[PDB]
Each structure stands twice: as C-alpha cells, then as structure tokens.
Amino acid sequence: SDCRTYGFNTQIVHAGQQPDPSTGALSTPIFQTSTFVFDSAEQGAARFLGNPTTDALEKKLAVLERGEAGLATASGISAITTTLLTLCQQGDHIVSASAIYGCTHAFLSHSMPKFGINVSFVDAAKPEEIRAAMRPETKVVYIETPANPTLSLVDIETVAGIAHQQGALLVVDNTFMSPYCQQPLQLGADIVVHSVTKYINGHGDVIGGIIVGKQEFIDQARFVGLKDITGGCMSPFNAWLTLRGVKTLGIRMERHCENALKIARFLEGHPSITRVYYPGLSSHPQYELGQRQMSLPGGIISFEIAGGLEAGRRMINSVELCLLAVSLGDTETLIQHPASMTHSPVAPEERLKAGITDGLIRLSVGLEDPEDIINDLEHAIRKATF
Amino acid sequence: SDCRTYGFNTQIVHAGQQPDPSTGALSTPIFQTSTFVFDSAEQGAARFLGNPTTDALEKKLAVLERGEAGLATASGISAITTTLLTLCQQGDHIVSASAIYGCTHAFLSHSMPKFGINVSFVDAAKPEEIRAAMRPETKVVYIETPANPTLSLVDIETVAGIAHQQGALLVVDNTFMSPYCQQPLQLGADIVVHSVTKYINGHGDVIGGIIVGKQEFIDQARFVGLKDITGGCMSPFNAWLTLRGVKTLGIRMERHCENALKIARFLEGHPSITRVYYPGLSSHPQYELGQRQMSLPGGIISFEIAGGLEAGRRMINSVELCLLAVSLGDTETLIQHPASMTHSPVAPEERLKAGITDGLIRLSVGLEDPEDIINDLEHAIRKATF
C-alpha cells in the first residue's frame, strides 16, 4: 500500500522503511559507506546528499510531519543553519521569536549580521509584534513552540497567515513536541526543523537534526545548503540509530506526557513551589491554544522553587534519581537549574530578561515510575526549603 | 612520556590515545552519547564541541600535522566551510587556487559572494599570481596540493611567506597527501584541513573532516564556527572508526605509494597512453619541488588515453578489477573518467578550462597486488584502443 494511508503509530513503525529487497533483512541495513560504485560510464553519467539508511529516516520524518521531503543533518543547529543559510543572503531580513534556544539566538544575533543578514527579535506570543517587524526584505519568520524556559506558546496557524500575507516563509522548530504532539506544516508552516537529539531519537545517544518541507526547498537545502555551505551530513550509523529510536516515538511520548502531567500536578500542589509551567495545567496562560495546537502537553516542565538561587542549588544537589544535565528528551529524567549552572556567568538582571529567574528549575520527565520521580523531587524540595 | 617525542609510526598508533583509566580498556571506548551528567550544580557551572572519542582523534591528528589542536567535522566540506566562515565576514576577501575540489569551488564562487565575501581565483602554481591578487581586505589564501586533476603542485613554503607578508593566513587542504606524506604547518601554513573520507580513514566507510591549527583559532572554529554556524559535528562512531582506520596510515600510505609508482611507470611505458601525471615520475613539471615538499609522491594518478572521449568510455567499461567510482583514497583501486561520467553535463570547451580533457582518466591506486591492477589496466587499455 502507501504508508501515508495508515494510522500514526503504524506510520511511526513502518513509514520510509521496508525489508531489504535483495536479502529480505527487516532492519534497515547500516550503509556505512562513503563510496558507491557504478556498473558503467553511462550508469555513472546518468546519476550525475544520499545514502539508503539516511534516506529511510528522511522519508519517515517527512511522512510523520506531513511534508513532501526530509533532509537529515549532523545536528539540530545544522538543520537550522542549513535551512536559513539556504534561504537567505546579504541584505535579507529575518523576523525571529525571542524565546528560542540560546545557540540559535547566537547564530541569529551574531553570525547572520556578519553575513549581511539582519534579524529582528520579537515576542512571538504576540503575533502583532511579528507583523510590525516585517520588512520588504523579510524572507523568513522563525519560531519555536513551546518556547523555553517558561513553555509559553506560539499560535502557528496565525503566525503562518501573517508571514504569508507579507510574502515570507514560516520556519518552525518543533523539537520539544515531536511530530507525535504537533505538526506545524498542517497548520501552515512551510518548513519544520528538529534537533533529533531530543524526542525523535529519544535515547540520548545521538546528536542530529532533520528538516522537512516541500521537495523544491529540500532539494536546495541538500544540493546547496548541505553540499556547498554547512557540510552538515548525518552519518549513516546515526541515521540508523535514529530510525531505531523513533520506532518507539508514540509509546515514549504517551508515557512522557502521562508522567509529566502527574509530576506537574504534584508540583502545583506543593507549598514550596511558587510557579509551575506546563501546558497541561489549566492555569497556563495559553491553555486553550495549547489544547487546539497540541495533541499532548509534552514531557518538559519548568517550575520555580521558593528561596531563589540558593534553594535552586540546594534542590538540584539533593536529587538522588533525577540526573543533572543540560539535555532534555531522554528516557531518564533530567533536571537543571539554569541560574546556578548554565547561566551563572550571566548578569542576574540580564538572565531575568531571558525569563530565567534565580529559582527556575527545568525538568525533562523520563520513563521511570512517576511515583519514584515525585518521591525524589519531594525529598529534594523538602531538603532545599527547610 | 610525551607522544610528540616518538617516531611518526609510533605517533600514528599511539598519539591522542591511552588505555581507559577506569577500566583499562585499550581501544578508545565509543562514547555514543549526547548527554553528559554533572555531580553537582557547582560542577555544572564550573564546566560552563566535546566528546572523549572525538577528542582522541583531534589530538592524534594535531600531533601528526605538528599543530596545536584539532577539530573534527561532519565532512571535509564542513572542515573547509567551518574554517572559512569562522575567519571571514561581509566585505572580506579570499585568494584561492583555481585547481581545487569542485564542491569547494562552488562554495567559494557562489556561496561566499552571497554573504558579502569576495573570492579571487588564481593559478597557485604561480606564486606571483597569488601576490598580485592580494587586497587590503584579503583575510585568507586558500590552496590545495597536489591539485587535481593533473596533480600539479603548489610551493607551500613560498606561498606562506607571501600571504604572511601581506597579513593573510594560509589555509591548505592536505587531503590527497595525508600527514604521512606532507605537513603544511611545518612549511608555514597556519591551518590544515582534510577530508578524512580519503586516506586518513582509508577504508571508504566514513565521511568526515578535520581541521588543525593554533589553539586560539581552533577554539573559535569550535565554539563559534561549529556551534554557531555550520553545526558540522562529527559523530563519536565516525570518530572511532577514523581512529581505527588511521592506525594503519603509515603502512597504507607506503603500499599505496609503492603500488602507484609501479602503475605509473607501466602507464608511462604504454604506447596507447599519451600522458601520465604522477609526482613520482621525473617527467613531472614540478618534480624537484615535489621531492622537497613530499615524503612520498602519493597514491593518486591521472593519465590520458589515446582516442579521447570514446576511448575513455571504452576503457572504464572494460576494467574487471578496478571499480568505477568518484571516490579516492580507499583500500580498493578506484577509477573514473570525468568527461563521460561526472562532467558530461559540462561543455567540452569549459571542461578543458578545468584541465579535464576528453581522454583524462583518474586512478586511486589501492592495496591489491600491483601486478593484478596492471594486468587489468593493460587489458582494458588494449580493448579500448584496438
């Protein structure tokens, strides 16, 4: 049949893959090669980036996002830069959300302008700010959603109409949702990018990225962006592992989301916790938008602990099961305290303008028994807050 | 001791590597992870791209090229672009050899100018052309040597002095030589780049690149170029395989060079072969320069077969052992006929301005018995030339 006709779990398992024609091997073979051979001069000319393993991953993700074609990359950052460096040149303009991944922010704020490409940062939770910042030279509107670190949302369908009316493309980073929870292209986005490093692979052992969009664009991203600009090839072994990890995407996302809701409710009920940011809680500022745009509220939670900086340090130093790390989207529950860890070299007043308060903790909820995670949190919080 | 003190074969085997401290495992473990964990908030802050497997490869190649530091990449193209996009910005200028890898040529001729970065192409076999093209805005001189497809040479030491006098850096693509045959940094180059896809890995199963240079530069290439521009990470599995492949670099290069000399002499003696391009033959235009600059003449050969385009096609369609492919630097002998294969979509008169004649064949000599390769060639040539 055609894999675009089956239910979503069936697509997760099967799309882009088939038993090996010549051997019947069911697993996609790892084509760990750099060299492909021709049968003849003619065969070689006719042919005149490409690998069967990576192709299977690209086709699968294209199906899952409901896009025409996929392109794998060496990293999520390379998926973002290959895309934007393919689309933009000296004199072009980009309108970007402000609440985005920090390294994306550095690329947009420092790298692009040095190539003659200007960027305007706006609060993408306010579509009007996006409209106001558009220019005749604007090629791209770039957004992330949910956005960290307070899990605020962006109304993709609305922003898409705005960008399109002014002749720009919409690019959406769908990393934190995965195709299982959100499909930006179905809401009008033109291009979706992911760090597969997170939920798509899910097993914390692959760095990689993926871009999905129209065939016309993807061909340019491949034959110019990858080939002639970033060189950000995904290795066939990484692609194989990502295919393997993605087989369980549906069941992992269900369990991540189930666990995260329970933990979020526990945190909301806890007197030592001042705030809890999780789209699955009714008290969330854009709760209804989230209900329409996302099939599930996700596995990521942020929260503020009473007592600011020192409480945040005490709490992370007191967990026994949760692991301290800056990654998110793995099978293990991961936790971090940006102010004391990643952003301590930053000015307190400046961190605040990023939405990073001294007491903010970020939590990636894993596949453990939620009771064990809650017990670990409860224990650490109690220790941290007297 | 210090691995920088041992003979070159000893460095090939040992540099950058040591038994695993905690387990004693001799092979460098494959750290196939995306997540690293901290023991504490303090430990996490202190720390504030990086992987132990990839680090071992980078350190090894730094030792072999006699440079301070190494940086692995997703591909040879990404080693080149990460380097040049790190060094250059809008308004800057590059002077480049014309006889370079085609995809490098596309990046330099089309991508860079679209970012406000101008490139002048020159015949790098003539150092005076390099000097003449220098401008106040010139940041970089870029060269490849030997250069394809006629294996002409560039006098690295001379070009280095010229670039430096005018305040530019010299970047050298050392792919076709490997550190075993040529060390550009010892001749004055500031930065060396490789596609490890060729001889450094040597086994035709890895796409990857490496950059070697001063610590100050490599840090910028890593924390800005890779992190904030190309995203061209090498996967830890690729790094492991490359470490494994490089263990035999010395013995592979010796045998490649021994075999190539024998085949080159056979070809030079053959009445159906009009020209043979191989630095190891005295008849080579820059033979003496090659003798001073290269420890060995290399494994790559180009030659012209009598009867132009159709003879070239006939010959490649008649080999039985040599494999038709556009790659070079593997254990198997590889052969290609650019005019009928890769460059047939190109204009005959334009190909010529690239140095690609209708009868030009390129040969990557592998580890087979040279007698078998010669027999295969002799058979194919005879068939091709009546």
Added chain:
Amino acid sequence: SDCRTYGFNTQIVHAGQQPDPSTGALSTPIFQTSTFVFDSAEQGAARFLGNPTTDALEKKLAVLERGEAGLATASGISAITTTLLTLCQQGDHIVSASAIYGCTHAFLSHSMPKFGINVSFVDAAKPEEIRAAMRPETKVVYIETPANPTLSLVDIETVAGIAHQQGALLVVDNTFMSPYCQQPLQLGADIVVHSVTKYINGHGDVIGGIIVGKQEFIDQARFVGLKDITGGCMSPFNAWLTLRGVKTLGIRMERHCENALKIARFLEGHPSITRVYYPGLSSHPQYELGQRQMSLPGGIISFEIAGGLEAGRRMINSVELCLLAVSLGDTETLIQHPASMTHSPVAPEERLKAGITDGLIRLSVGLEDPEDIINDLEHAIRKATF
C-alpha cells in the same frame, strides 16, 4: 541509592547503569575492545567473561528477574546450552517439557544423548508427568511458558516444588514473557534463560541470550560454560544495543499486550476463525493460572483459520501490513504459517503430534495501530476463506 529499591519501570531505565565516572557520559559507553591493559605486574596478577558494557546489561537483567547475577551470551540457544552443559555430564538426566522451541528440542533430543546425557520429554502442563519421569540421576527440569504453538501454560511454582523435592534444579525459558510479564525466580525457579532476540531487545536487530541465577551458578556458567565449553560471548555492541532496546521494555510490553488483546478479541469474534489461543482470553484452558502467574497475557497469539493448509497459505499471501517471518517479539507485526512455511518438510501426522495443525497461524503483535492490523487481518482472512 540501591536500584533494587525502585519501581519496575524505574529499574528498567536505571538498573545496572550509571553515568560514566571519568567523563560523565550518560549512555553506557560501547567498550568495543578485546584488550585490557594493566598498570603493573602486580595489578595484572591480582586480577587473575568480562566487559563493562556487557556487565551493565547482565546487572540490569539480574535486577529485573530478581536474581543475583546475569550472564550474556551470543544467542538464546547459547544461553540454554551454556547453562545445561555447565550443569550436566555423562550419565546425568534431564526432564524436559515437550512443548518447547524446536532448536532446543534438537539439542535435547540429539546432541545431549551423544554426550551421555539422557532426556525425558513430558507434557509440562501436567506436573504429575514431570514427577513420574524424575530419576536418581535427574539434575535438571527444563520448561518453557507460555509454550508454543498453542500458548499452553506451565505452573512454575508447582513444578519448582516438585523438582526441588527430588533434588533437581528448575530452569525456565522466559523468552515469550520477559521479566516485565513473568518472574520465574520469584516463583521458585533456580535459573532463567532468555533469547534477548525477542522482547528484551525488542527491535529485531540483535541475536543474543541471557542467563540469570545465583552468583555461585553464574560464576560456573561464566568461567567454565562460556570460557571452556560453548565460547558463546556476547559482543559489547550487541550488549549496548540490548541495553538501549530494554529502556523501553515496560512501554513496549504494555502496548504489545494492549494490541494483542484487541486483535485476539477480533479473531475470536470472526466466523472464519475456528480457534484462538491467547492467555488473555477467558476461554483459555489455564486462564486462572495465567492470571496468577503473569502480569499481562503477552504479545503473541496463535489461531486456526477455516479450511486448513490452503486457507493458511492464502491468508498469509494476502496480508499487506503484517510481515511474513519466523521471528517474534519485534516492533513490527510478524506472521507465519508453520505448516506451509517452516514445517512443510515435515509429515502431516507428525506435525499434529507437535500441535501444528494445517490451519495454525502464529502472530507476533507489534506497535502499529491495532485498527490497521485488524483491517489487514480481516482483509486477508476474507480473501482466504471466500
């Protein structure tokens, strides 16, 4: 803490694993080495099979089965033979279930007797037959449950008491259940073995086995059985993949079992299906025993289609989503018709004595949407049965 204290899902994720001490890498490093180095002669003597990756897998499975120690092997068959060849010698006796894996049957019926080791086969669904077959020389009672191909059950606790009273050990093949659905050691078995090739790895890309039991036994299985008899080492890469696959064991088993129940009910309601064998259906002969012994009824189903041999062939030749294969326990739904496929070289009357009727179909239910599987089955059945 101690991983034996956490809930079962938490153990699945965490048991046997921890971030790498020296680097903090969260994924267990792949120690793909054959060589370990000593710091000194003394250090080498003190030390006087073993690999850190494989150790992590062995420790994890030991925790999940509630046994003292684990031992990984090159295959499920090697887990079984390493165990039994470690325990038994010339003149010893084994009492075995008759309804076991065919290749196990061949080892027991032909190999063992040629080594002076006698085996009596019995219907293990009848504990009295086990007792009756015991001899003074009986070292081992061996059983599988559920047993194929009709998914009949064996009362582990009862058989354990019988074997022990007569001084024998009980060995249980727990492949079809996994530790998530059944824990034989908690019911009195002394040793559990698995083909990890099925549910424990779950991704159809690893052949391997595991043995769990007391430390005293496992040491003998390791230093004599593996080292001095079968040589059935698991490679560290296989162990790594198995660790990776097992991370999702809980969520995979839940979904396999949920899907299988739905499909089993559909089949039971279908007029072209004469019988359906699935422990989750009340109509199953040992339903209550299954309820006490198994947390879930499993992902495997057998059923008989109307019209015997030719109907069975027609049906398997008519599925479009289910894949034809002799494996079971993967993410994809797999189907087979033993009589027309694997057992067609066998005598019809003999197949019957194995419980293989002409219309028997075996189904391994995967992670696809159950609706899609049911539609595929419904379509194939209808075609097969007019």
Added chain:
Amino acid sequence: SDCRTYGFNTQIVHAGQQPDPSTGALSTPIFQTSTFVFDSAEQGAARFLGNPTTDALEKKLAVLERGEAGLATASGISAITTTLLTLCQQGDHIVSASAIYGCTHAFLSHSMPKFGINVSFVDAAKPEEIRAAMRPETKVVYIETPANPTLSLVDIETVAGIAHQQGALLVVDNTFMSPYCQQPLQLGADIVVHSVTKYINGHGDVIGGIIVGKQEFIDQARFVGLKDITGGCMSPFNAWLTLRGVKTLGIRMERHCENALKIARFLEGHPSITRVYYPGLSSHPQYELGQRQMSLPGGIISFEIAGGLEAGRRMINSVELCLLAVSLGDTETLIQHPASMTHSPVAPEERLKAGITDGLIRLSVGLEDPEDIINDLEHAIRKATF
C-alpha cells in the same frame, strides 16, 4: 572474474566482497538484523547460520586459507569447541598437542572427558608421539603452530599424513600465523580454526573466531554445531569490523614481521637476555622447517631475561611504550610476564612443565617504529638487570 584467481593481496582486499547490487554501496552493508522477511508462503518454505555481512567474511577467509567454506563464530574458543563438539561424541578419542592455548587445554582436559570424550596430550614437535597415541577410536588430531610460549613448531604436512593414514582428521589452530603466513589446508590439514581476535582482525576491538574446511563439514558445523550445540553466533557488526580489519592483513603482517625480526635480533645481541625464541632467528631449533612451512616468521617473540622472576617483574614495570596485557596480535606492542602475571597462582615446578620459566617474557610486536620499541625494551631491561 573469480577471486580465487588473483594474487594474495588482491584476494585480501576483494575476496568474498562486492559492491551492493541494489545500491552500489562499496562497503559491505552492516546487516544488523535478526529478522528476515519472506515475499510469500512458498518463498518461505523453499528457504527451509546466515547473514550477508557474516557470509562475506566467511567466504573471504575460505579463499585466503584455500578451503571450500568458512563459518564465523562468537570467539576463537567457540571456533574450536564448535568444531570438536561437532566431530566427536561419547567414546571418541582426540590426540592433542600439549603446547596449546591454556583455555583450549582446559576444554580438552576437563570438559571433553565429562562428555565421554577422551584426550591424549603429546609433544607435537615429535610426530612419532602423535602416531603412538592414536587409537581405533581416534577421530581427531589437534595441533597449534607456532606453539606458545617458546614458539616451537609442528610439521603440519607430516602430521597430516600420519593422522590420515590412521583414519583421523587433522585440525590446526592457525591463529598466530594468519592465512598470510601459513596455510595449513595446503599442507594437508582438513580443518583450520582461528581466533580472529588476533591478527585477522588485528585492531584489538573484536572477539571472534572462524572455521574453514570442506563444505560437507562446515554445513554440519553450522546446522548442528552452532545451531544445536554451542550457539556461538558471530554478530554482524563484529563480522563487519573483522572484514574491515582484514583489508590491511597483508600490509600489517609484513610490518609486524619486519619489526619483530629487528627486535628479535636486538634481543639476541643483548647480554642481559639469556634466550630469544623467534622462528626468524637461525638459532631456532626447527629453523628450516619454519622456512618451508611459513612465508614469514611472525610478529610474536618470547625471550628470557637474566635474573628470573624478580627481573621479569622489574622489566615489565619499567616499559613506557609497550603495554602490559595478555592479548597479542594488535597494532600496539603488547608485553606480558606469565610467571608474575597470569600464572603466579600456579606452582613454580608446574609452570616449568608448561615451558613457563620465571624469566620468560612474551612480546607481541606492533606497528610502532621498531627503534622506539627497541629503545623502550633497552631502557626497561637495563633498569631490570642493574
């Protein structure tokens, strides 16, 4: 053509391998699968162990040893036991060399007799002892050569004639030579086995074994020995790495042998060294036999240091480049002192009956510059011997 027609280096590179038919991939794909799918019931029956990657390795090694067929295994020990447990049953007899690998000795001395299989150990350097020990029940003569730890030799051709005249098969462990240095089947042996863990893989990152012999035997070793007895499957990833490692077998063996000869001569000239055992030295007891039977004398050396046990300890504790390890046949130079390390739990007088004197050092010479190894040895010896 037919790969059995090319020179030996050409076979090393090419035999058993070809570009992937469907994709043209030159590297043998890693078929990391446990599941193979059928197109139909008929196709499934017709078919009624096997993996395309492993098949390529088996075919290659069969070509290199000039045997009909190959069978890969989980380890060298499993290659030996799968072979002998396939050939022998209760009441059968084996005549074995005494100077063999210790773990082989344990299998033969303890395991086999417990299965009703008797073994007689003899000094295989004396063919007459082999003849004298033959019985009507003798199925197999088993030998290793060179034999450790004094590198004594066995005259394969002579022993083969003796075994055959009395109706037995000759099995030869060719691990220390590799097919590049010795081909037992060409000298009359019926079956060759290797630990590929040593020179065939060569990179110290694979444990595995291989068996080569007639198709009739190999089929039994595969479908009964592996399938129904040891279960000692080689994983497809291990097979791929072994194929990769073997590509450089010719050039590695040449360099190992060149380096070992230089080191052996240095040691023979050294006044603190009492004896040096290396077939490449004229002073070797069976020098001429070695010249006829072996193309090269090998990479392994044993020697005795003045001052017995304590000198041996001092010397190994004083090397700075050589690595202490019990492995041999890697790219790094490895060294060990059996008496102080591996065999210190053994009785001094008993070690001697094994040929292990207190001063015996074993050295596996790697690919480093021989000058560096010699300097390291010279330094350690001097320190060790005042």
